[PDB]
Amino acid sequence: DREQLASVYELRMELEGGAAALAARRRNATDLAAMAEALAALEANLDHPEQGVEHDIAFHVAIAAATHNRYYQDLLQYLNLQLRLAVSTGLTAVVHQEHVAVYDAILAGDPDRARLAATRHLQQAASRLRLDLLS
Amino acid sequence: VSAGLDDREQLASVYELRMELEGGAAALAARRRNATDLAAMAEALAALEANLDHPEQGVEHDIAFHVAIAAATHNRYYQDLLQYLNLQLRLAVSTARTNSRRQEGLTAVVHQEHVAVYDAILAGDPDRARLAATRHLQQAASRLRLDLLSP
Ligand SMILES: [Zn+2]
Ligand SMILES: [Zn+2]
């Protein structure tokens, strides 16, 4: 059950790393606005965790839309939808640091740094979930 | 052309997603492969090796090799998505294409790519396995584009 969930989390981690790499090379000015407006809303709502969830979804969705691959986006959306349904319940600040490193790498046009920023965000998040469920 | 630009763009997108999934599967397989996984990859590879002059018989073996790697991830979700994606239909057989591919020696080039993934997975080396699996998918998409532009 935690390992049925963990199996989806592993697959999402691989795909999200790839999405950031494609987004690093194919991002539009339109793609940059959606990631930036989601990031600014995420920065505004640091003291309201419940409002921030919509923005984190919007930020990852903007990276997925920046791939310009419909098949890739549909699979990422389906895995993301499955994970939200399965896990129904400095956190504001450390997650913003991880969220910002992906955005800078994508802004730079650097695919390798983007993949590692996106991968590190998923790994640190996974470590936070494992430990929360134990206590 | 056998396929027009929008069919070529959709196909390249499908290979692009397949490329990323194969790279993740090779890395997972490199770390977690057990004695039963090594036997299944070796057996499919031996069969592909034995059928270099018969491209027709090869398809079944190619699916078995990619499927054994997906099993070696030991992630049921990844394995099942890959089993489904590797049943994908391939480009139609043509007398002209079959004659040019033999002169090509396409099967030997492809065997070296299938072989580079097995060697990396056998060596318990994840970055090497991911690099070989991604290269296999990139070359296949590139070969497929040239075939769609040439009939
Ligand atoms: Zn996030
Ligand atoms: Zn193959």
Side-chain angles (χ1 to χ4, degrees), chain B residues 91-92 96-98 100-101 103-112:
Chain B
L91 174 69
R97 215 90 74 176
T98 202
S100 92
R101 294 172 167 183
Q103 174 66 37
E104 271 236 40
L106 164 52
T107 68
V109 173
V110 171
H111 196 62
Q112 275 155 96

Short mmCIF file of all heavy atoms in Angstrom, two decimals, chain B residues 90-112, unseen atoms left out:
data_model
loop_
_atom_site.label_atom_id
_atom_site.label_comp_id
_atom_site.label_asym_id
_atom_site.label_seq_id
_atom_site.Cartn_x
_atom_site.Cartn_y
_atom_site.Cartn_z
N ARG B 90 4.46 -1.64 -35.82
CA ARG B 90 5.66 -1.13 -36.52
C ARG B 90 5.30 -0.83 -37.97
O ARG B 90 4.22 -1.16 -38.38
CB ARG B 90 6.83 -2.07 -36.28
N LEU B 91 6.21 -0.16 -38.67
CA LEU B 91 6.03 0.26 -40.08
C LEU B 91 5.86 -0.96 -40.98
O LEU B 91 6.60 -1.91 -40.86
CB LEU B 91 7.24 1.12 -40.44
CG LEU B 91 7.34 1.55 -41.91
CD1 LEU B 91 6.27 2.55 -42.30
CD2 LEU B 91 8.72 2.06 -42.26
N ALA B 92 4.95 -0.87 -41.93
CA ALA B 92 4.65 -1.97 -42.86
C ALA B 92 5.87 -2.41 -43.67
O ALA B 92 6.60 -1.59 -44.16
CB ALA B 92 3.57 -1.52 -43.79
N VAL B 93 5.99 -3.72 -43.85
CA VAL B 93 7.05 -4.40 -44.64
C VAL B 93 6.88 -4.07 -46.12
O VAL B 93 5.79 -4.22 -46.64
CB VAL B 93 6.90 -5.91 -44.42
N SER B 94 7.95 -3.69 -46.79
CA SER B 94 7.93 -3.38 -48.24
C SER B 94 9.04 -4.18 -48.90
O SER B 94 10.09 -4.28 -48.26
CB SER B 94 8.19 -1.92 -48.48
N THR B 95 8.87 -4.61 -50.15
CA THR B 95 9.96 -5.34 -50.85
C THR B 95 11.19 -4.42 -50.94
O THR B 95 12.29 -4.87 -50.65
CB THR B 95 9.53 -5.79 -52.24
N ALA B 96 10.97 -3.16 -51.29
CA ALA B 96 12.04 -2.16 -51.42
C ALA B 96 12.71 -1.90 -50.08
O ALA B 96 13.91 -1.83 -50.03
CB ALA B 96 11.46 -0.88 -51.98
N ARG B 97 11.92 -1.75 -49.04
CA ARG B 97 12.50 -1.44 -47.71
C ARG B 97 13.31 -2.62 -47.19
O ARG B 97 14.39 -2.37 -46.70
CB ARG B 97 11.41 -1.06 -46.71
CG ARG B 97 11.87 0.00 -45.73
CD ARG B 97 11.57 1.39 -46.25
NE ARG B 97 10.17 1.67 -46.15
CZ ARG B 97 9.63 2.83 -46.46
NH1 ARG B 97 10.39 3.78 -46.92
NH2 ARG B 97 8.34 3.04 -46.32
N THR B 98 12.78 -3.82 -47.32
CA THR B 98 13.43 -5.08 -46.90
C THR B 98 14.74 -5.31 -47.66
O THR B 98 15.50 -6.08 -47.15
CB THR B 98 12.49 -6.27 -46.67
OG1 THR B 98 13.21 -7.14 -45.81
CG2 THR B 98 12.07 -7.01 -47.93
N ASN B 99 14.76 -4.97 -48.96
CA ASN B 99 16.01 -5.08 -49.76
C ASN B 99 17.00 -4.00 -49.32
O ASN B 99 18.16 -4.32 -49.19
CB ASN B 99 15.77 -5.09 -51.27
N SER B 100 16.56 -2.76 -49.16
CA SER B 100 17.50 -1.70 -48.72
C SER B 100 18.00 -1.92 -47.29
O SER B 100 19.12 -1.51 -47.04
CB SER B 100 17.00 -0.31 -48.96
OG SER B 100 16.30 0.18 -47.84
N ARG B 101 17.16 -2.40 -46.37
CA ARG B 101 17.59 -2.69 -44.97
C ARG B 101 18.64 -3.83 -44.92
O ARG B 101 19.49 -3.79 -44.08
CB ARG B 101 16.40 -2.83 -44.03
CG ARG B 101 15.63 -1.53 -43.84
CD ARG B 101 14.34 -1.69 -43.07
NE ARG B 101 13.66 -0.50 -42.58
CZ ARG B 101 12.56 -0.56 -41.85
NH1 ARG B 101 12.05 -1.72 -41.52
NH2 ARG B 101 11.96 0.54 -41.46
N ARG B 102 18.52 -4.85 -45.75
CA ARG B 102 19.55 -5.93 -45.79
C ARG B 102 20.88 -5.35 -46.27
O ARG B 102 21.85 -5.51 -45.56
CB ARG B 102 19.09 -7.06 -46.70
N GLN B 103 20.87 -4.54 -47.33
CA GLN B 103 22.08 -3.87 -47.89
C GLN B 103 22.64 -2.93 -46.83
O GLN B 103 23.84 -2.89 -46.68
CB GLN B 103 21.79 -3.15 -49.20
CG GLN B 103 22.97 -2.35 -49.72
CD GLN B 103 24.12 -3.24 -50.12
OE1 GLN B 103 23.92 -4.31 -50.66
NE2 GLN B 103 25.34 -2.80 -49.85
N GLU B 104 21.76 -2.25 -46.10
CA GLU B 104 21.92 -1.40 -44.90
C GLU B 104 22.74 -2.14 -43.83
O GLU B 104 23.46 -1.49 -43.12
CB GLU B 104 20.56 -1.21 -44.25
CG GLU B 104 19.71 -0.04 -44.70
CD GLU B 104 19.31 0.85 -43.53
OE1 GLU B 104 20.18 1.06 -42.66
OE2 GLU B 104 18.15 1.33 -43.49
N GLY B 105 22.41 -3.41 -43.64
CA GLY B 105 22.87 -4.14 -42.45
C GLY B 105 22.27 -3.49 -41.21
O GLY B 105 22.97 -3.27 -40.27
N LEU B 106 21.00 -3.14 -41.29
CA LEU B 106 20.27 -2.44 -40.21
C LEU B 106 20.27 -3.28 -38.94
O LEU B 106 20.59 -2.74 -37.95
CB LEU B 106 18.83 -2.20 -40.69
CG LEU B 106 17.83 -1.84 -39.59
CD1 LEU B 106 18.32 -0.69 -38.77
CD2 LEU B 106 16.45 -1.55 -40.12
N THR B 107 20.01 -4.57 -39.06
CA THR B 107 19.90 -5.50 -37.92
C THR B 107 21.21 -5.50 -37.16
O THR B 107 21.16 -5.47 -35.98
CB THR B 107 19.40 -6.89 -38.34
OG1 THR B 107 20.39 -7.54 -39.12
CG2 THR B 107 18.12 -6.91 -39.13
N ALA B 108 22.36 -5.47 -37.82
CA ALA B 108 23.59 -5.47 -37.00
C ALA B 108 23.73 -4.17 -36.19
O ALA B 108 24.25 -4.20 -35.10
CB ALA B 108 24.79 -5.82 -37.81
N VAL B 109 23.37 -3.05 -36.78
CA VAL B 109 23.44 -1.74 -36.07
C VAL B 109 22.52 -1.76 -34.86
O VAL B 109 22.94 -1.34 -33.84
CB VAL B 109 23.06 -0.58 -37.01
CG1 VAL B 109 22.97 0.73 -36.28
CG2 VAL B 109 23.95 -0.51 -38.23
N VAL B 110 21.31 -2.27 -35.06
CA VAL B 110 20.29 -2.38 -34.00
C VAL B 110 20.73 -3.36 -32.92
O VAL B 110 20.56 -3.02 -31.78
CB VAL B 110 18.89 -2.70 -34.54
CG1 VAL B 110 17.92 -3.01 -33.41
CG2 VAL B 110 18.36 -1.57 -35.39
N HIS B 111 21.35 -4.47 -33.30
CA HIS B 111 21.82 -5.49 -32.33
C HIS B 111 22.83 -4.89 -31.38
O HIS B 111 22.73 -5.17 -30.24
CB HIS B 111 22.37 -6.74 -32.99
CG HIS B 111 22.47 -7.87 -32.03
ND1 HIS B 111 21.39 -8.40 -31.42
CD2 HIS B 111 23.52 -8.55 -31.58
CE1 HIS B 111 21.75 -9.36 -30.66
NE2 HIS B 111 23.03 -9.48 -30.74
N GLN B 112 23.73 -4.06 -31.90
CA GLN B 112 24.77 -3.37 -31.11
C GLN B 112 24.08 -2.45 -30.10
O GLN B 112 24.59 -2.31 -29.05
CB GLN B 112 25.80 -2.64 -31.96
CG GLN B 112 26.94 -3.50 -32.44
CD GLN B 112 27.63 -3.04 -33.70
OE1 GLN B 112 28.65 -2.38 -33.65
NE2 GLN B 112 27.12 -3.40 -34.85
#
